[PDB]
Structures are given as C-alpha cells and as structure tokens.
Amino acid sequence: APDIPLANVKAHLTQLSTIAANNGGNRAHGRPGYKASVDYVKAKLDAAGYTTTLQQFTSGGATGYNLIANWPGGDPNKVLMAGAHLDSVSSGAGINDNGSGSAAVLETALAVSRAGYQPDKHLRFAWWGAEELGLIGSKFYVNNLPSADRSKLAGYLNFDMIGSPNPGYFVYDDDPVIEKTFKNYFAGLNVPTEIETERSDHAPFKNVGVPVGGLFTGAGYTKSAAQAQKWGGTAGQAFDRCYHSSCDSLSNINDTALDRNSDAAAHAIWTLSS
Numbered sequence: 225a226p227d228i229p230l231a232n233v234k235a236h237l238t239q240l241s242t243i244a245a246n247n248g249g250n251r252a253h254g255r256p257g258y259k260a261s262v263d264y265v266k267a268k269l270d271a272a273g274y275t276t277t278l279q280q281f282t283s284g285g286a287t288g289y290n291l292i293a294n295w296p297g298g299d300p301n302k303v304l305m306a307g308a309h310l311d312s313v314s315s316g317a318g319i320n321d322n323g324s325g326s327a328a329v330l331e332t333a334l335a336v337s338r339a340g341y342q343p344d345k346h347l348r349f350a351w352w353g354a355e356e357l358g359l360i361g362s363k364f365y366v367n368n369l370p371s372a373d374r375s376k377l378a379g380y381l382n383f384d385m386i387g388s389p390n391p392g393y394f395v396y397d398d399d400p401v402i403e404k405t406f407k408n409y410f411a412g413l414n415v416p417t418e419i420e421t422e423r424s425d426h427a428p429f430k431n432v433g434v435p436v437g438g439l440f441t442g443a444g445y446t447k448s449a450a451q452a453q454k455w456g457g458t459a460g461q462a463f464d465r466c467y468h469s470s471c472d473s474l475s476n477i478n479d480t481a482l483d484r485n486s487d488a489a490a491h492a493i494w495t496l497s498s
C-alpha cells in the first residue's frame with residue numbers, strides 16, 4: 225500500500241473549511257454546506273476515473289445525499305467498502321467530526337487511481353449524509369440494498385473522527401480479521417492501540433451481518449494518565465475538546481494522528497482487497 229501524503233489530506237480539510245465558511249459556517253444536513261461538500265468530493269472522484277452515484281433521501285423534511293464511488297473492476301461478488309460520514313452538526317464546520325474521516329477516505333480513493341491498483345475484490349467507497357440525525361444515510365443505503373447485493377459485501381470499514389487533537393488510537397472490536405489488520409499496522413509503527421468503547425455508520429452494516437471495523441481517535445471522554453503515558457497529549461482533557469462545537473475547525477486536528485490513521489486506512493484497504 226502507498227504512504228498517504230498528509231499534505232493532500234490536509235488540502236481536502238482546507239477545502240471543506242472554506243466550504244463551511246462560504247455557507248453559513250457548517251456542512252449540516254439540509255443546509256447548502258452539505259451539498260457543496262458532496263460536490264467537491266464527487267468532482268475529485270469523477271476526475272480520477274470512478275463511477276459515482278448520488279443517492280437521494282429525505283429526512284426531517286429536507287433532501288440529503290449519499291455519494292457512492294465504485295472503482296471499475298475486481299470480483300463483483302466480493303466487494304470491500306470503506307466510508308465516512310460527510311455531514312457536520314450545525315454548530316460548526318465539523319473538521320475533525322468528520323472532515324478527518326471523509327478526507328482520509330477520499331485521498332485513499334485517489335491513491336488507488338494514482339497507483340493504477342487493480343484489486344482482487346471490487347472496491348466501493350461511500351460518504352454518508354445525515355449521520356448526525358441518527359445514521360440516516362447509511363441506514364438508507366443498507367435498507368435499499370437487495371439481499372443479493374448485501375451478500376456480496378466482504379466488509380465495511382468506517383472512519384469517523386480520526387484526527388482528534390489530544391488523540392487516542394482506538395480500533396473497533398467487531399470483525400476479528402479487519403481488527404487484526406489495523407492492529408498489525410500500528411504494531412509496525414510501535415504505536416499501541418486500545419479497543420473502541422466510546423453510534424456511527426458501521427452499525428447498519430453490522431446489524432445485517434456484514435463484517436465491519438474502523439478507527440477512532442476519541443471524542444468527549446477524558447484521556448487518562450495511563451493513556452497520556454502511551455500516546456502523549458494531556459491527561460485529564462477530552463480527546464476532542466471541540467466535539468460538535470463551533471471550534472471543530474482547521475485548528476482542531478492533530479497531524480500525527482491524522483497521518484497515521486490515513487496510512488492505516490490505505491494499508492487495510494490494500495490488504496483486505498487482495
């Protein structure tokens with residue numbers, strides 16, 4: 225797998241920040257900042273050769289959208305998917321929650337095209353709308369997939385908050401194989417990981433039997449002294465002091481955590497699609 229360039233991931237975050245500033249300060253469902261975010265991500269994917277689909281749904285009286293991107297080729301009967309929600313709450317730009325996951329998945333998709341990668345399994349990436357209203361977009365996607373297509377899913381990897389300013393490195397403890405894949409990558413960097421315990425888009429998939437996994441760097445919970453010992457940062461302070469707040473801006477990102485988790489996302493996607 226390629227090393228994902230941190231500068232490219234940060235460039236997507238800068239674009240999402242500008243989009244929020246030009247649209248009222250947020251990228252929330254039913255507000256113009258959300259569709260403008262979908263348009264930026266879709267244009268990058270279309271230029272890289274993906275087949276993109278906009279899925280529309282209505283929630284709370286407003287139109288929301290999921291963006292699905294398929295990389296042509298691979299085994300149509302074994303699909304590996306990775307996703308991240310693209311909406312923010314209305315109080316701010318949602319740069320760590322969840323511009324961080326959205327940008328990492330987008331740069332991983334672009335890396336597949338730049339590398340000329342031809343996976344054994346078919347790759348599909350998704351950016352979900354309305355996660356902050358109760359996983360509405362990912363529930364819409366799973367509820368609308370015919371059982372024949374659901375059975376072709378080999379796994380779903382979720383990235384929601386991966387650049388927290390006072391980070392922890394948490395790996396989901398769902399499918400054992402996906403979990404091991406992420407844990408082995410962090411072991412190679414000598415960065416310890418803990419099981420995720422602190423409610424995101426992998427839930428609809430998990431509920432119907434699709435293997436799931438993912439990464440998380442923490443939100444409102446307080447980092448303990450033992451955790452500050454193994455990862456640095458500040459004990460006694462939240463992992464993300466700007467969770468769902470107006471200060472979840474470009475300055476609410478820890479570059480090391482964002483780089484590590486973006487590289488881990490690419491490693492898992494390359495490993496599991498072989």
Ligand SMILES: [Ca+2]
Pocket residue numbers: 227228229230483484487
């Ligand atoms: Ca990197």
Ligand SMILES: [Zn+2]
Pocket residue numbers: 309321322384385
């Ligand atoms: Zn989130």
Ligand SMILES: [Zn+2]
Pocket residue numbers: 313321356468
């Ligand atoms: Zn959130």
